[PDB]
Design a protein around this ligand. Structure first.
Ligand SMILES: [K+]
Ligand SMILES: [K+]
Ligand SMILES: [K+]
Ligand SMILES: [K+]
Ligand SMILES: [K+]
Ligand SMILES: [K+]
Ligand SMILES: [K+]
Ligand SMILES: [K+]
Ligand SMILES: [K+]
Ligand SMILES: [Mg+2]
Ligand SMILES: [Mg+2]
Ligand SMILES: [Mg+2]
Ligand SMILES: [Mg+2]
Ligand SMILES: [Mg+2]
Ligand SMILES: [Mg+2]
Ligand SMILES: [Mg+2]
Ligand SMILES: [Mg+2]
Ligand SMILES: [Mg+2]
Ligand SMILES: [Mg+2]
Ligand SMILES: [Mg+2]
Ligand SMILES: [Mg+2]
Ligand SMILES: [Mg+2]
Ligand SMILES: [Mg+2]
Ligand SMILES: [Mg+2]
Ligand SMILES: [Mg+2]
Ligand SMILES: [Mg+2]
Ligand SMILES: [Mg+2]
Ligand SMILES: [Mg+2]
Ligand SMILES: [Mg+2]
Lengths: 56, 147, 125, 52, 128, 187, 53
RNA sequence: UUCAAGAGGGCGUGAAACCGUUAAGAGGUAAACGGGUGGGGUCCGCGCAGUCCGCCCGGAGGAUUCAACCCGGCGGCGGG
RNA sequence: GGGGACCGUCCCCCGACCGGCGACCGGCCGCCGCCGGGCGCAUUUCCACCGCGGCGGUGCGCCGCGACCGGCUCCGGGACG
RNA sequence: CGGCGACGUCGGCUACCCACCCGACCCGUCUUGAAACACGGACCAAGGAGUCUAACACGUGCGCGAGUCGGGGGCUCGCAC
RNA sequence: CCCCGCGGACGCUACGCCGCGACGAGUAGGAGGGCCGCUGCGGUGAGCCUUGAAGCCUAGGGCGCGGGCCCGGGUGGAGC
């Protein structure tokens, strides 16, 4: 509690966090989410294939 | 080569790797095996059990030659003769068995570790173990003693 | 073998020069004169070298023949080209490319021939 | 004086150094890389008649 | 006029001044050559503000412009004409310079040959 | 600042042979290419064994190789060991063997060849099976060394059967107090 | 020094050392059709960091 | 005199500490130091009308010979 | 004690088949390439000069200015729900 | 896209002197703690301190491998090496 | 079935070169690298040198994070 500040993000907060600062852990590397193929390669088996799916 | 050693890397470092607090001093703890029952007791007990005390009977003027009795196991027995000897015996039609003189090869006692190939052989030795004799007779061989 | 002989002389050779964070090799048939397996002029079954002519004009294209690899006296065939620069480069291009004689050295030999010819023309005032 | 100046090398080591040295002496690239000017030598495993 | 290098990138030097040894200003017996301070209370080793800076790998030059002379060339020391022809195919990236011990008569031939091969000499007029 | 520990960042592993053997370096080059440009995990294991030290490449006796080759379903397979193959004079019958080894003892080599066997080096194995198909990758006993008798718990501790370091073996050398109940204790 | 099929007749116990690599022609081995058939296609495109717009 | 006494009988070279003189600069917080600039000065830059070179176009001149064929020589590759 | 026989490795040969001419070499052919000499003697080829020529590359002796594009950032207007 | 270029200027963040702003206590050492009213240090030069032998242990490299090792001795023109 | 063009950059010291991501305090202490440095030996540089070696001096030009190094000028006089 003394070390964190937290709350309940709204839809706009999720969008701007993912789009501006969204980085994926791909092969243990911090890779910027510049293409949808980066999301689909690692998360397509779960049905997530784009930034919109990740945000949803 | 002195160029490959830690001394070349410890130049400019004041304590030469021995440390500022403890320093490097002549003989802290004693010289040699000092205090093996006192301040070095744990090391001696941990790594050298049995070090302190007498066990057994002493024997003055031990002569190692009198007890000289090298041993050979049955698995190595056929290596004392030539490869010609063992193929000839195997393909021999008769019951002729080659003679292996382990005393000639430098062994006095025949021990019985391993197994023998299924072919008879006459083994000459000063001493035989009980199991070595049993295995030699199992393959149809014989054990004969020499002095 | 070239790879085996390379492992012997890659760092231990009389032609090796290691100065100023750079490395150079001075064997006779080394285009670019660099210490490398590709450009070494001694370890390969076929090599090509470009040298200035004995006089002050033209180039000498030396190739290594395939037969006497252990016979250095007759192992190299030297030809002299003493024509215009464009025709000289064409001859070297045809010797390397048309014969398929070490095509990986084509531009290195052509560039070296240009440097030699450029050095042979008189300086200006 | 008792610095242990000498070293013993196994005989099989030493024979195997000789074999490597002899095999290297028949390859032009290695002999040239020692700088021996074997430019016009007829043949590097170079053998002459017993008359010499 | 002078032979130009193949490319002339902007050379960026992180530090332009020498790392002088601690207290080399106070003693003649201590030379400016850098030595890492290892004293228990040394404030330079502890990196107190306003003190003599310590060299570290962060000051390293860009690998693209390392060992590059202000003229955009890199130098190869040469001792005779034969060593000069190793730079024939490195004309536009490496410049020759003649070793200090080479005689006046012999370095005349080196300068003459280097002018022919379009190799740049950093000290072309050095004994005359 | 970030909250991590840097004491395990550098993994300690052989990335190349510490040997300067130019022939070993050549076939390291060959198998560095094969491991990279194929999906065969056999090439990866062989490549990393080539880096290994001699103690990590124990010799493989002829008896052990024969015994592993005699297991069901391994007929007409190549025995691959990254190390030395050693003659075992305790065996009398050598079957036909297809063998790839870094090094073969002269007596072992003569026995294998006389029995109609075939011996390959690792350059020939690459041409024969580039992916290592139809091979049995064997290893000598890694702990078949005298040092491992001394490793483990300390000898002067209960339920430890580790060999102590003694200059001599005899009734006078470390057989008294701490070794028998009559002499203080035994544990 | 002997052959690989004769022991030396003037050293009574010596034989030529054995090769651990019969064919030390790396270029020829790698270009052999047996090796080339087993390989995957080379990945020669360089992927440089993408500036996150 | 000597090549040289800027080699002159404890004389090859001739450092540092320290000192004299000359030149420049500065000076009430002991000097000295790190970072950042500014001023001055000694030098460096063949600085001082500032690159080179590939192709093509145009102009004005020379030289063979350009290609293709013939002869000879030498190489590379292939051949039941 | 010799001398023999046998066995294991050898040896140089008399010969055939087998895989290939190989990184062990030659002769013949075939293709290609280079060089030398002829011929080809000019809408070809090559050499040097000039243009304040064009296209490319590198880079401007020094000191400066502008423009648009992209990245990061701090701000300001306007409008909608 | 502009300006300026030889006896006066152009560039040289390095290097010499000076000025200003900010920062800055003297090192070494023992110590929980040194700028210390804790010790050593006036200055400069040259010298100056983990070495060698033996014995173990483990790791690594090399050769051979159920073996391995000639180190003592002997044989080789007795010796430039 | 390339051919009006017969042509098409660089590379790969594989102990090399290239890409991506994260990370960077440190006494005692440990390890790695050192194209850091000194002296001598085996090789090698058809190395350097009285047309000037070593050493020393230097408001001279530079290189390296650094240990240090190269070059100019002077002095010096036989080696490096
Ligand atoms: K220590
Ligand atoms: K650090
Ligand atoms: K671990
Ligand atoms: K004098
Ligand atoms: K004091
Ligand atoms: K001996
Ligand atoms: K030398
Ligand atoms: K440096
Ligand atoms: K001098
Ligand atoms: Mg320390
Ligand atoms: Mg000290
Ligand atoms: Mg101390
Ligand atoms: Mg610097
Ligand atoms: Mg000082
Ligand atoms: Mg402290
Ligand atoms: Mg950090
Ligand atoms: Mg840490
Ligand atoms: Mg004088
Ligand atoms: Mg004097
Ligand atoms: Mg004065
Ligand atoms: Mg103290
Ligand atoms: Mg106290
Ligand atoms: Mg203190
Ligand atoms: Mg106080
Ligand atoms: Mg005291
Ligand atoms: Mg004193
Ligand atoms: Mg005092
Ligand atoms: Mg000293
Ligand atoms: Mg750190």
């Amino acid at each position: 509690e003394p070390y964190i500040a937290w709350g309940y993000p709204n839809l706009k907060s999720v969008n701007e966090l993912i789009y501006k600062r969204g980085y994926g852990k791909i092969n243990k590397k911090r890779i910027a989410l510049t293409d949808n193929a980066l999301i689909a390669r690692s998360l397509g088996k779960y049905g997530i294939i784009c930034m919109e799916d990740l945000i949803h | 080569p002195s160029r490959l050693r830690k001394t070349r890397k410890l130049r400019g470092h004041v304590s030469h790797g021995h440390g500022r607090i403890g320093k490097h001093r002549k003989h802290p703890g004693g010289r040699g095996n000092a205090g093996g029952l006192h301040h070095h007791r744990i090391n001696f007990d941990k790594y050298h059990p049995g070090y302190f005390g007498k066990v057994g009977m002493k024997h003055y003027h031990l002569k190692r030659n009198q007890s000289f009795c090298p041993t050979v196991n049955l698995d190595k027995l056929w290596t004392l003769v030539s490869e010609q000897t063992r193929v000839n015996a195997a393909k021999n039609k008769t019951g002729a068995a080659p003679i292996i003189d382990v005393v000639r090869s430098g062994y006095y006692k025949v021990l019985g570790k391993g197994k023998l190939p299924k072919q008879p052989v006459i083994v000459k030795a000063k001493f035989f173990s009980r199991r070595a004799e049993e295995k030699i007779k199992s393959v149809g061989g014989a054990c004969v003693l020499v002095a | 073998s070239a790879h085996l002989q390379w492992m012997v002389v890659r760092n231990c050779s009389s032609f090796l020069i290691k100065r100023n964070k750079q490395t150079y090799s001075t064997e006779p048939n080394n285009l670019k004169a660099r210490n490398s397996f590709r450009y070494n002029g001694l370890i390969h079954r076929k090599t090509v070298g470009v040298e200035p002519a004995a006089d002050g004009k033209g180039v000498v294209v030396v190739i290594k023949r395939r037969s006497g690899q252990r016979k250095p006296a007759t192992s190299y065939v030297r030809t002299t080209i003493n024509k215009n620069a464009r025709a000289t480069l064409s001859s070297i291009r045809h010797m390397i490319r048309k014969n398929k004689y070490r095509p990986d050295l084509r531009m290195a030999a052509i560039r070296r021939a240009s440097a030699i010819l450029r050095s042979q023309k008189p300086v200006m005032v | 004086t008792w610095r242990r100046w000498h070293r013993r090398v196994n005989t099989t080591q030493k024979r195997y150094a000789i074999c490597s040295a002899l095999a290297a002496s028949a390859l032009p690239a290695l002999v040239m890389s020692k700088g021996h000017r074997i430019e016009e030598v007829p043949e590097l495993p170079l053998v002459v008649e017993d008359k010499v | 006029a002078a032979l130009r290098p193949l490319v002339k990138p902007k050379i960026v030097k992180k530090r332009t001044k020498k790392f002088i040894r601690h207290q080399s200003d106070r003693y003649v017996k201590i030379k400016r050559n850098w030595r890492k301070p290892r004293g228990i209370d040394n404030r330079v080793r502890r990196r107190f503000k306003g003190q003599i800076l310590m060299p570290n790998i962060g000051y390293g030059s860009n690998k693209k412009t390392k060992h590059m002379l202000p003229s955009g060339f890199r130098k190869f020391l040469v001792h005779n004409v034969k060593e000069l022809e190793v730079l024939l195919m490195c004309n536009k990236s490496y410049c020759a310079e003649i070793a200090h011990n080479v005689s006046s008569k012999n370095r005349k031939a080196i300068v003459e040959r280097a002018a022919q091969l379009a190799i740049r000499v950093t000290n072309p007029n050095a004994r005359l | 600042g970030v909250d991590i520990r840097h004491n395990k960042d550098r993994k300690v592993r052989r990335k190349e042979p510490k040997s300067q053997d130019i022939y070993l370096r050549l076939l390291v080059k060959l198998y560095r290419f094969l491991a990279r440009r194929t999906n065969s995990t056999f090439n990866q294991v062989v490549l990393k064994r080539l880096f290994m030290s001699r103690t990590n490449r124990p010799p493989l006796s002829l008896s052990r190789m024969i015994r592993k080759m005699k297991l069901p379903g391994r007929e007409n397979k190549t025995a691959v060991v990254v190390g030395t193959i050693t003659d075992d004079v305790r065996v009398q019958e050598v079957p036909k063997l297809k063998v790839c080894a870094l090094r073969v003892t002269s007596r072992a080599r003569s026995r294998i060849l006389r029995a109609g066997g075939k011996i390959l080096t690792f350059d020939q194995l690459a041409l024969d099976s580039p992916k290592g198909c139809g091979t049995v990758l064997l290893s000598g006993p890694r702990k078949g060394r005298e040092v491992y008798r001394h490793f483990g718990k300390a000898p002067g501790t209960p339920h430890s059967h580790t060999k102590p370091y003694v200059r001599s073996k005899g009734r006078k050398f470390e057989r008294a107090r701490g070794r028998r109940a009559s002499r203080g204790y035994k544990n | 020094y002997g052959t690989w099929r004769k022991a030396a007749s003037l050293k009574s116990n010596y034989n030529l050392p054995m090769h651990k690599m019969i064919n030390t022609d790396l270029s020829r081995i790698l270009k052999s059709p047996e090796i080339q058939r087993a390989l995957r296609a080379p990945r020669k495109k360089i992927h440089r960091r993408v500036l996150k717009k």
